[PDB]
Coordinates of C-alpha atoms in Angstrom, one line a residue:
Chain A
X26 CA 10.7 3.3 -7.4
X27 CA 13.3 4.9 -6.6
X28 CA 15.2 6.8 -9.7
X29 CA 15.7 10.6 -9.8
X30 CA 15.3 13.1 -12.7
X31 CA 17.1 16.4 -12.5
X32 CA 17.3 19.2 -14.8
X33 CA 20.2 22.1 -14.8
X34 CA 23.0 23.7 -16.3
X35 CA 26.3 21.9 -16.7
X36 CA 29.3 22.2 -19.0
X37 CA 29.6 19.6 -21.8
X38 CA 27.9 16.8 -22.3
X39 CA 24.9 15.5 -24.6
X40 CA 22.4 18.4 -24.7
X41 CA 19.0 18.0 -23.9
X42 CA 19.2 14.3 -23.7
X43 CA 18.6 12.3 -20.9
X44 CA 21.4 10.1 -20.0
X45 CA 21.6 8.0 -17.5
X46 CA 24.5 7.7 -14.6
X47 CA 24.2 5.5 -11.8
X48 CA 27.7 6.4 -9.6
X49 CA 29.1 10.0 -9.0
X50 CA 32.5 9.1 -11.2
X51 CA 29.9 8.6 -13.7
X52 CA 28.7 12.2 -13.5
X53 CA 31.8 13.9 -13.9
X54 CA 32.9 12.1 -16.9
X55 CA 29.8 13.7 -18.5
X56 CA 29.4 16.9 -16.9
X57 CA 32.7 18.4 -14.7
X58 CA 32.4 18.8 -11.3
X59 CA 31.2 21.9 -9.4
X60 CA 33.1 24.0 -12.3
X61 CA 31.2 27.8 -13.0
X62 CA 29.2 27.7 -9.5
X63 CA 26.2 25.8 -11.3
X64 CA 23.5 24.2 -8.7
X65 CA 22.9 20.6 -10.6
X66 CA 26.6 19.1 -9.9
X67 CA 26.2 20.2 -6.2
X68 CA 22.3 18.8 -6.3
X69 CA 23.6 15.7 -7.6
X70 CA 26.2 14.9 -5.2
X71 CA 24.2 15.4 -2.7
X72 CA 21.8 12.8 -3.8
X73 CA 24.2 10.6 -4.3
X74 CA 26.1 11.0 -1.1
X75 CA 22.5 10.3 0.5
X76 CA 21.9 6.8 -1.2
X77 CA 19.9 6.1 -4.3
X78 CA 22.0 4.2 -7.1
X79 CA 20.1 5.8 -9.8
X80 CA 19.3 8.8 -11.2
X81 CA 19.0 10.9 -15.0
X82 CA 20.2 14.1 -15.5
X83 CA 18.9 16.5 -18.6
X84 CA 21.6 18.7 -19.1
X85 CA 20.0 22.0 -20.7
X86 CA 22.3 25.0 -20.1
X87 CA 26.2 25.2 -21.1
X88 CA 29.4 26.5 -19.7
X89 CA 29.6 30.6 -20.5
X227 CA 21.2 32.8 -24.2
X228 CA 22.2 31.0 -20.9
X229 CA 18.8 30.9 -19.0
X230 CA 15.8 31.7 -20.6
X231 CA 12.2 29.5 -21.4
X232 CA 13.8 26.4 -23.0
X233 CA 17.6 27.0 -22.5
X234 CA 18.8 27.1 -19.0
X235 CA 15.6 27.1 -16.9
X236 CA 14.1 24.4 -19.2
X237 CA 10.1 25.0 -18.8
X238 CA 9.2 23.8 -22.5
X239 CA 7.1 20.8 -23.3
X240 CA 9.2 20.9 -26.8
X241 CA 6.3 20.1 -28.5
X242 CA 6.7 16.5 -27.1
X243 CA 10.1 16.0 -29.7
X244 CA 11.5 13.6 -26.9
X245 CA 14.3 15.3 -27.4
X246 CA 13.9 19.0 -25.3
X247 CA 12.3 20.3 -22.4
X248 CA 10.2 18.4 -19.8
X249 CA 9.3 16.1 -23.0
X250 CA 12.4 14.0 -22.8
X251 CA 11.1 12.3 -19.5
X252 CA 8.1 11.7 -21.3
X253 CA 9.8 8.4 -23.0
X254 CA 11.3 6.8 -19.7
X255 CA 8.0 5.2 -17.8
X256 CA 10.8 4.8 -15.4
X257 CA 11.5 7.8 -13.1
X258 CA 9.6 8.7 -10.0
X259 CA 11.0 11.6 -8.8
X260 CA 11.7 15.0 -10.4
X261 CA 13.4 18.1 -8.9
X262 CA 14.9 21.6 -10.6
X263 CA 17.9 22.5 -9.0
X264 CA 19.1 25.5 -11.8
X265 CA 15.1 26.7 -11.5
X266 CA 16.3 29.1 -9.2
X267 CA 20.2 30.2 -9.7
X268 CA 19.1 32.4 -12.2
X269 CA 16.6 34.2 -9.8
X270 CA 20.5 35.1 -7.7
X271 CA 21.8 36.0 -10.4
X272 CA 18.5 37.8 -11.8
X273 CA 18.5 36.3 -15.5
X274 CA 15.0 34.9 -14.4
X275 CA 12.2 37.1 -13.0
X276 CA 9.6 35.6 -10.0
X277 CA 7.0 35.8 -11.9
X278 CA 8.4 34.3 -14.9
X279 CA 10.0 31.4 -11.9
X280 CA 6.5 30.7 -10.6
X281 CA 5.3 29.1 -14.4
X282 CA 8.2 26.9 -14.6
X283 CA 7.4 25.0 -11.6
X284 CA 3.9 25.2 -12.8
X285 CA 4.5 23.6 -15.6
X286 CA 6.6 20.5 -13.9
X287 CA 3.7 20.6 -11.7
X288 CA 1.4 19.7 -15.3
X289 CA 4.1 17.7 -15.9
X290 CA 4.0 15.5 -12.8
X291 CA -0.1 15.8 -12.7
X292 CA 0.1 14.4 -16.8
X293 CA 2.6 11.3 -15.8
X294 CA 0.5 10.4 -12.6
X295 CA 3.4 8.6 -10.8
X296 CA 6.6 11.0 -10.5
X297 CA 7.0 13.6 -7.4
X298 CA 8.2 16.8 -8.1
X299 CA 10.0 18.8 -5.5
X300 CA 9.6 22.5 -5.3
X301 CA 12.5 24.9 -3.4
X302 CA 11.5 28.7 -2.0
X303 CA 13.1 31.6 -3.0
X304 CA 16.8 31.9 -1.1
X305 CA 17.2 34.1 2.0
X306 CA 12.9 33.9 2.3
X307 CA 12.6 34.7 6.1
X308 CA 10.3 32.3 8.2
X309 CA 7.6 34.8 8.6
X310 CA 7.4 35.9 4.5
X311 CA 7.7 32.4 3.3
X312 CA 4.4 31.5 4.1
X313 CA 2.9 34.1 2.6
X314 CA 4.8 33.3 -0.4
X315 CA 3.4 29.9 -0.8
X316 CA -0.2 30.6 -0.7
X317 CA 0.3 34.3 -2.7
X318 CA 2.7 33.9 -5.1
X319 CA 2.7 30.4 -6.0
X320 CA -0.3 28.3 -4.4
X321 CA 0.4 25.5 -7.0
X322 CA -2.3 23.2 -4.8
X323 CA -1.3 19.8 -6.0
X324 CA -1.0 16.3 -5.4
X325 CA 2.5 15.7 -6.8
X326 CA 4.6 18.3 -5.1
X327 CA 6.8 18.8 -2.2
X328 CA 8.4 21.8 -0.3
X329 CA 11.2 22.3 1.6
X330 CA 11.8 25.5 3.1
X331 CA 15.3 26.1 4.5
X332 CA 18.5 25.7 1.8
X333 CA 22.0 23.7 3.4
X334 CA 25.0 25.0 3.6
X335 CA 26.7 22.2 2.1
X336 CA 30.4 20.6 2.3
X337 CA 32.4 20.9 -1.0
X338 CA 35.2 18.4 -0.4
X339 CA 37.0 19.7 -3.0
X340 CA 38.0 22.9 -1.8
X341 CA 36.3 22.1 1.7
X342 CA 34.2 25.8 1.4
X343 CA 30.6 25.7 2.5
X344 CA 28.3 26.6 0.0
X345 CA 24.6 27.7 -0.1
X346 CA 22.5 24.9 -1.9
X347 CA 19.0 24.2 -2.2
X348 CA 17.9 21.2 -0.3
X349 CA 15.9 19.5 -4.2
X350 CA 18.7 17.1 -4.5
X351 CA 19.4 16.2 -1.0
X352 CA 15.7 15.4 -0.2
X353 CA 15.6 13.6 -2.6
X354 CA 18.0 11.6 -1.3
X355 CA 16.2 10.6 1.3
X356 CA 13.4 9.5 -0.5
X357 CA 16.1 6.7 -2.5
X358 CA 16.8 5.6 1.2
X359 CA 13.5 4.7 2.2
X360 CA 12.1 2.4 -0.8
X361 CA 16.0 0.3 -0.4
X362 CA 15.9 0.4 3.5
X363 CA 11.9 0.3 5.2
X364 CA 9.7 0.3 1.6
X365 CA 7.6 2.6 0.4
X366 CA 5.6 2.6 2.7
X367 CA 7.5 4.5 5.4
X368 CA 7.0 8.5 5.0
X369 CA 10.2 10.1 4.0
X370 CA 11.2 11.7 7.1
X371 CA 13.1 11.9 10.2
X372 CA 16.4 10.9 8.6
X373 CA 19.6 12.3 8.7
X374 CA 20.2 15.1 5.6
X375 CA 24.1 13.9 5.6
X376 CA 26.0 15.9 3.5
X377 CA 24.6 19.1 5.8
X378 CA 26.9 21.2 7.1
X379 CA 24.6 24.1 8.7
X380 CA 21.3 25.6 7.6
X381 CA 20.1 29.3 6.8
X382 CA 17.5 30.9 8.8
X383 CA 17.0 28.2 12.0
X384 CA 13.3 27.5 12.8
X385 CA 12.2 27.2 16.3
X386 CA 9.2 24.7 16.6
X387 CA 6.5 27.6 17.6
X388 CA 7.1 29.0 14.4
X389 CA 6.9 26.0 12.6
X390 CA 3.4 25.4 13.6
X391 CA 2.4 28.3 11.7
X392 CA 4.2 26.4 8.6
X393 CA 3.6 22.7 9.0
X394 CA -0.2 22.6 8.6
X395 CA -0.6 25.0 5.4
X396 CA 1.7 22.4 3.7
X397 CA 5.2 23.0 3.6
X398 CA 7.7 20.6 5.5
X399 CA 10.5 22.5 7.2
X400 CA 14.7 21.0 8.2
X401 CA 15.8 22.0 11.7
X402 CA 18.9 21.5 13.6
X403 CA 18.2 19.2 16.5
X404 CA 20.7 19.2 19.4
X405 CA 22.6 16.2 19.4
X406 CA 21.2 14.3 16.5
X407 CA 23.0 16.3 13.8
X408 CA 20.2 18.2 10.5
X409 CA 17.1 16.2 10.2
X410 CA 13.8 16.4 7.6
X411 CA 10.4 17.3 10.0
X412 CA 7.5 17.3 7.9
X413 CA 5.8 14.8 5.7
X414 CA 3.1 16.8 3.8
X415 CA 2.2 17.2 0.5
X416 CA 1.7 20.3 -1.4
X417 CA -2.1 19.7 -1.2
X418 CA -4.7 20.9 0.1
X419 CA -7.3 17.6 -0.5
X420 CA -7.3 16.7 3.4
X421 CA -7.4 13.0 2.1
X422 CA -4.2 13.3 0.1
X423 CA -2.2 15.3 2.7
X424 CA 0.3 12.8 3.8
X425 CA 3.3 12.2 1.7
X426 CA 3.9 8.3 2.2
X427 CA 0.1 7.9 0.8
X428 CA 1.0 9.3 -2.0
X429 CA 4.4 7.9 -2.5
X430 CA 2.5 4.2 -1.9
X431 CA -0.3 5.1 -4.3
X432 CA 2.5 5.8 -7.4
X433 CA 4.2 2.7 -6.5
X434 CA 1.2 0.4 -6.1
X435 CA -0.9 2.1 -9.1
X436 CA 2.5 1.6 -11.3
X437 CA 3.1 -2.0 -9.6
X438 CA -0.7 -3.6 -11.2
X439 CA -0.5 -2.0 -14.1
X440 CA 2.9 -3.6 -15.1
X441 CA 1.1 -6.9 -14.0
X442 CA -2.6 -6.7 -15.4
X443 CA -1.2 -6.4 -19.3
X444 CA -4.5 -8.0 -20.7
X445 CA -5.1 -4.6 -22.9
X446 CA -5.8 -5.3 -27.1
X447 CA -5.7 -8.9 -26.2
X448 CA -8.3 -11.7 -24.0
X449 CA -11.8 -11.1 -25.7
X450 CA -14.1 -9.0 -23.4
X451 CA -17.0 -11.0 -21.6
X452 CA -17.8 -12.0 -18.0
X453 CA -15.3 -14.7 -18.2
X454 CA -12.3 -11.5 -18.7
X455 CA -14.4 -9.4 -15.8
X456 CA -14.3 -12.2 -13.6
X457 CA -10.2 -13.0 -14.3
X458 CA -9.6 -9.4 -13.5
X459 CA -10.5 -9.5 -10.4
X460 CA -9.0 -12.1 -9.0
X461 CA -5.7 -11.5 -10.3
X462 CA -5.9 -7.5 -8.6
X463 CA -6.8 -9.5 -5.2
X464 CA -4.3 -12.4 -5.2
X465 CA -1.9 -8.9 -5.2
X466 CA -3.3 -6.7 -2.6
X467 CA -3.9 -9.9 -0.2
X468 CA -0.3 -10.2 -0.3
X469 CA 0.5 -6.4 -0.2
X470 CA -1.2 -7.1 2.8
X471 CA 1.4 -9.3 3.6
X472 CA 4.2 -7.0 4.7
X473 CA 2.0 -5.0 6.8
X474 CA 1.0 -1.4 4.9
X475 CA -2.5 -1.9 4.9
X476 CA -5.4 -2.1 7.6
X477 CA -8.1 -4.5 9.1
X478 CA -6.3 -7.6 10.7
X479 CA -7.3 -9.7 8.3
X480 CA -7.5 -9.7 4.2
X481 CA -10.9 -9.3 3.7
X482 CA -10.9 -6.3 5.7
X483 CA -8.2 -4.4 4.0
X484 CA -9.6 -4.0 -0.1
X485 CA -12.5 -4.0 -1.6
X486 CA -13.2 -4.8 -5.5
X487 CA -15.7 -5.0 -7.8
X488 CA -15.3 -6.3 -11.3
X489 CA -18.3 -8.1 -12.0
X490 CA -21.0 -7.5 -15.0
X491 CA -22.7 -4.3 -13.3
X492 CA -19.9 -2.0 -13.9
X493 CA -19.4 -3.1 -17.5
X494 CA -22.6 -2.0 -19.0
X495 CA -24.2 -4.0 -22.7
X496 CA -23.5 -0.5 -24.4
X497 CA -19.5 -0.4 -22.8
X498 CA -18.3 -1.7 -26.2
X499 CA -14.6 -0.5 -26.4
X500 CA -14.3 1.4 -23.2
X501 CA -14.8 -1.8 -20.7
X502 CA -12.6 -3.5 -18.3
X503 CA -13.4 -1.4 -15.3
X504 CA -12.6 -2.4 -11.6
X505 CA -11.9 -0.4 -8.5
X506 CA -9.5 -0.8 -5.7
X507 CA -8.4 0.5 -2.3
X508 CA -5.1 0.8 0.2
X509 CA -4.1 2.6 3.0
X510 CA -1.9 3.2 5.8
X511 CA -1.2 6.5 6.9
X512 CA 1.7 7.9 9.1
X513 CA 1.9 10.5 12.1
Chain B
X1 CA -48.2 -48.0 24.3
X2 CA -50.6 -47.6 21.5
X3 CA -48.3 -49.9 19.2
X4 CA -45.3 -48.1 20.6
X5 CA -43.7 -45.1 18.5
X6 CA -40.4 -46.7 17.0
X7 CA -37.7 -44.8 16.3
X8 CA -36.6 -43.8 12.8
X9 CA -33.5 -42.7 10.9
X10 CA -34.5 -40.5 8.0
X11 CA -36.8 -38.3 9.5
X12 CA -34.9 -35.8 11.8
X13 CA -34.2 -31.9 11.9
X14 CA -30.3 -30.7 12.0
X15 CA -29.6 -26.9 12.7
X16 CA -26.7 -24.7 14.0
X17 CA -27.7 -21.6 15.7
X18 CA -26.2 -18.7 15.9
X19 CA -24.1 -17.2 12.1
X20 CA -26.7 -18.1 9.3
X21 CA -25.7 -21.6 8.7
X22 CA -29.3 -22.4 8.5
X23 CA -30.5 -25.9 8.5
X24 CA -28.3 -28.9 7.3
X25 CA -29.0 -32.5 5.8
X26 CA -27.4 -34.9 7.0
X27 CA -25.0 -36.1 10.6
X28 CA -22.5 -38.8 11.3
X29 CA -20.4 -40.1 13.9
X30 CA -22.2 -38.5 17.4
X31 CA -20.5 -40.5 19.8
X32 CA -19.4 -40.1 23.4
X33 CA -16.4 -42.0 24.7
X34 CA -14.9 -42.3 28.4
X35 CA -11.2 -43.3 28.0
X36 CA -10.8 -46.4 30.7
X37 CA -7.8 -47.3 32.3
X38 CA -6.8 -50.4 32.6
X39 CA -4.9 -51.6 35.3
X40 CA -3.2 -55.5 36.3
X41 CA -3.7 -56.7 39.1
X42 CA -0.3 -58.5 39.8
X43 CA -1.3 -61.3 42.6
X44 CA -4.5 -62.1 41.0
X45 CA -4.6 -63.3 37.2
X46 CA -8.5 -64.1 36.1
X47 CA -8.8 -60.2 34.8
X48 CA -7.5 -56.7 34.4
X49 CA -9.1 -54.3 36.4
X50 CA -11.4 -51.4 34.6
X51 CA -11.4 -47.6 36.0
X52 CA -13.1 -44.9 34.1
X53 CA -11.2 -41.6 33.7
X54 CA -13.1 -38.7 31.9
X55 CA -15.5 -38.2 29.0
X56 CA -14.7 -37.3 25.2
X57 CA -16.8 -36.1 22.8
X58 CA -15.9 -37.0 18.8
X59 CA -16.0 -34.8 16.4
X60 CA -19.7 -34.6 14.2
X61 CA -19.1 -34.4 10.0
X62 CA -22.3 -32.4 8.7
X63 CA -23.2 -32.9 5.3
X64 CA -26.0 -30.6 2.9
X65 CA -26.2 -29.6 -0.7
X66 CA -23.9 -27.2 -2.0
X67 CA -26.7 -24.1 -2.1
X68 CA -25.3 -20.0 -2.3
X69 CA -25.5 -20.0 1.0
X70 CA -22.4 -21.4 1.3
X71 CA -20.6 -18.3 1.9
X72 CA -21.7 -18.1 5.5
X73 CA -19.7 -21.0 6.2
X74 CA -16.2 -20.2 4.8
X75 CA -16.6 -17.1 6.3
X76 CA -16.9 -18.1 9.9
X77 CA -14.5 -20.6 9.4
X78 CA -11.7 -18.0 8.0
X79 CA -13.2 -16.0 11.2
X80 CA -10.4 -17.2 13.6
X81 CA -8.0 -14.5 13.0
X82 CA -10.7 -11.9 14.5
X83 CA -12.2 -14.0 17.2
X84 CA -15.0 -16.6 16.3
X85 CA -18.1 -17.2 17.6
X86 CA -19.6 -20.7 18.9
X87 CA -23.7 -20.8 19.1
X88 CA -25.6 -23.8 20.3
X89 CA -26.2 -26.6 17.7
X90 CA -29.1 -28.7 17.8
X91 CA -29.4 -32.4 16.4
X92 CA -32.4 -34.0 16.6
X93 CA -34.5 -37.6 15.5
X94 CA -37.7 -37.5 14.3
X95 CA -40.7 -40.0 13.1
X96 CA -42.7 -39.6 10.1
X97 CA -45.2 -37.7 12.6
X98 CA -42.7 -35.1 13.6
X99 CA -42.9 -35.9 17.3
X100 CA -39.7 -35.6 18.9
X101 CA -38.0 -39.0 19.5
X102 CA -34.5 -37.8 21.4
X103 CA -33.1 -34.1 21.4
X104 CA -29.6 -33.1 21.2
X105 CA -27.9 -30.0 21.9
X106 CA -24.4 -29.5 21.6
X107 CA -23.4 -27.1 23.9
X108 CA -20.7 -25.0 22.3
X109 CA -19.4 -25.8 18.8
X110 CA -16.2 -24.8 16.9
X111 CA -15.3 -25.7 12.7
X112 CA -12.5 -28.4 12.1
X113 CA -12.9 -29.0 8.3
X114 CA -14.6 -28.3 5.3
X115 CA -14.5 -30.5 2.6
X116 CA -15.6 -29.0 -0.7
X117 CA -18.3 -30.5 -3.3
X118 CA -16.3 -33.4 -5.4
X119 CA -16.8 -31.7 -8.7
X120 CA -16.6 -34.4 -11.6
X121 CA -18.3 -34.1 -15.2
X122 CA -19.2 -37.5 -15.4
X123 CA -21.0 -38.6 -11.7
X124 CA -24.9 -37.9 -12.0
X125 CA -25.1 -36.4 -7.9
X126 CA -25.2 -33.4 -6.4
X127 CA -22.9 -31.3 -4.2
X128 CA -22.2 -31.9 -0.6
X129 CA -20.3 -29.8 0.9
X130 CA -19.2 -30.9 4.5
X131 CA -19.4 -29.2 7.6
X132 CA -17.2 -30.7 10.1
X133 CA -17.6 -29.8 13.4
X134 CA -15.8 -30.0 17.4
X135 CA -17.7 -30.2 20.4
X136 CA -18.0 -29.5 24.1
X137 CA -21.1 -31.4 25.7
X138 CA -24.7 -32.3 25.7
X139 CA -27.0 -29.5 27.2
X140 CA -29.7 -30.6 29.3

């Protein structure tokens, strides 16, 4: 619900194997601490600065074939091995929330060309639309400009899908260490956020409007005229308000289904799709008949009624709010094997 | 006249108007009561002195078989949350002729229970479900 997945260079360590760290002292007994200028152990702390207990880090690159396909930039499916690329968070059924912080820190330092950038992130996107429950979130070239970013998104990349999000502006983080600002991309932060809401207001609040502490300044200020020409297309935006310190404006997907657009929708969807299917396990087991068809159904209700319950849904009253239909017409004589069919419904959209 | 026209009790005609609750089966307990107050006269013993003070109507429990139908029901009932709806009932005696004896009406109605059919493998009967029902006065 709310676990992270990141993927990046950093010295020592397991390679290529997910671990699993749940504090920041945890972290950098594994992999240093902000040694060689690599983006991950910044992109971590970050994240863990802004809430969220959990989060699994797939340590790739090494301390110096630095970046390339597989090593550095991971983009590999490793032939699902479990063991490299993308394919390691294959075996977690757990995570559900993926970012890239090194994606790009070879672009700076120009071991990675923009077109050979734009398929990485394409691929995580397949990854993301295979797994159907983890969020990938996608970072813009540094030093973009306001007016040449959004002709970036819809010319260079256009990924169009229902499991992404971008945010434009990079932080100037705090490095309390040697107390330097530093230029960061916002992945690991934002994802911070997103650990905040589930453990503070549910899932069913959008990730938004919440302090990005650990912010120091941000590149390239937006006014809110020229955000208007941004918002819409699909890509969120971080501005400095006076007074109330570097706040997240913009809950959109990268999408362009106008009934998918919101972010919290799709944040609910992955939680409540993942939270039935961990309940309804009556799969190579309960004989199939009407008696099964009929069970099914009232066991998916007895759940949504009470999702109901803590508000997240619409229609002042139960009946009002789903509506399903697991009775003999949508299992066809001739739906041997391939039964067990049932729809379902939620909703509750934000501004 | 014409060797009168006695009243019966099993003909009759029982209907709620309004959401399709249709036509029922069977009706106990129409009664109106005035709640007297009673008061002692303290120089005078021989009685206790008897002053009406309002008019209550009971509660009616409507009874018919358990048909498909019975959907209509539960859902008015479980209506309350988004505003219900109280039509005009109707109970009625009838003779064997069906000639009205003495019309009812019950002006505005409202549910209060609704006992379920007794299910039970062995007892050779048929479902009742019941309908009970509040009350606000006889039309006229």
């Amino acid at each position: 619900t709310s676990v992270a997945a990141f993927v990046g260079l950093a010295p020592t360590g397991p390679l290529n194997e997910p671990t699993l760290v749940t504090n920041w002292t945890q972290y950098v007994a594994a992999f240093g601490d902000f040694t060689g200028g690599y983006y991950l152990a910044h992109s971590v702390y970050g994240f863990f600065n802004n809430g969220g207990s959990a989060a699994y880090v797939v340590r790739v690159g090494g301390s110096a074939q630095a970046e390339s396909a597989h090593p550095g930039p991971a983009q590999y499916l490793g032939d699902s091995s479990d063991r490299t690329g993308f394919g390691g968070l294959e075996a977690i059924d757990e995570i559900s929330m993926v970012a890239v912080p090194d994606l790009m820190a070879a672009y700076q330092r120009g071991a990675i060309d923009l077109e050979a950038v734009k398929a990485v992130q394409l691929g995580l996107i397949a990854h993301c639309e295979l797994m159907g429950d983890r969020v990938a979130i996608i970072d813009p070239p540094p030093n973009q400009n306001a007016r040449q970013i959004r002709v970036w998104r819809q010319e260079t990349a256009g990924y169009d899908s229902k499991y992404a999000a971008l945010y434009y502006p990079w932080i100037k983080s705090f490095d309390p260490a040697t107390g330097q600002s530093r230029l960061v991309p916002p992945s690991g932060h934002v994802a911070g956020i997103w650990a905040r809401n589930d453990s503070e207001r549910g899932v069913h609040k959008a990730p938004a409007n919440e302090v990005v502490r650990g912010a120091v300044d941000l590149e390239l200020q937006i006014t809110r005229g020229e955000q208007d020409l941004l918002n819409p297309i699909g890509v969120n935006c971080i501005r400095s308000f006076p007074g109330r310190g570097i706040r997240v404006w913009g809950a959109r997907t990268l999408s362009s289904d106008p009934a998918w657009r919101y972010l919290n929708i799709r944040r609910y969807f992955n939680y409540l799709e993942e939270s039935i299917l961990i309940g309804t396990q009556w799969v190579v087991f309960e004989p199939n008949d009407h008696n099964l068809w009929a069970r099914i159904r009232r066991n998916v209700s007895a759940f949504l009624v009470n999702e109901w319950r803590n508000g997240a849904l619409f229609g002042q009253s139960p009946d009002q709010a789903y509506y399903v239909k697991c009775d003999e017409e949508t299992n066809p004589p001739e739906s041997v094997d391939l039964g067990r069919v049932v729809c379902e419904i939620g909703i509750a959209p934000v501004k | 006249m014409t060797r009168k026209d006695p009243g019966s009790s099993i003909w009759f005609s029982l209907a709620i108007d309004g959401e399709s609750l249709g036509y029922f089966n069977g009706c106990e307990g129409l009664s109106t009561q005035v709640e007297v107050e009673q008061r002692q006269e303290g120089g005078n013993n021989g009685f206790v002195w008897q002053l009406p003070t309002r008019v209550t109507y009971s509660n009616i429990r409507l009874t018919r078989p358990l048909t498909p139908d019975t959907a209509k029901v539960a859902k008015w009932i479980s209506s309350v949350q988004t505003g219900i709806q109280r039509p005009t009932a109707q109970i009625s005696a009838l003779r064997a002729d069906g000639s009205l004896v003495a019309r009812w009406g019950l002006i505005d109605v409202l549910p209060v229970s609704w006992q379920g059919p007794s299910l039970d493998p062995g007892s050779a009967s048929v479902a009742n479900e019941v309908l009970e029902i509040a009350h606000h006065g006889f039309t006229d």
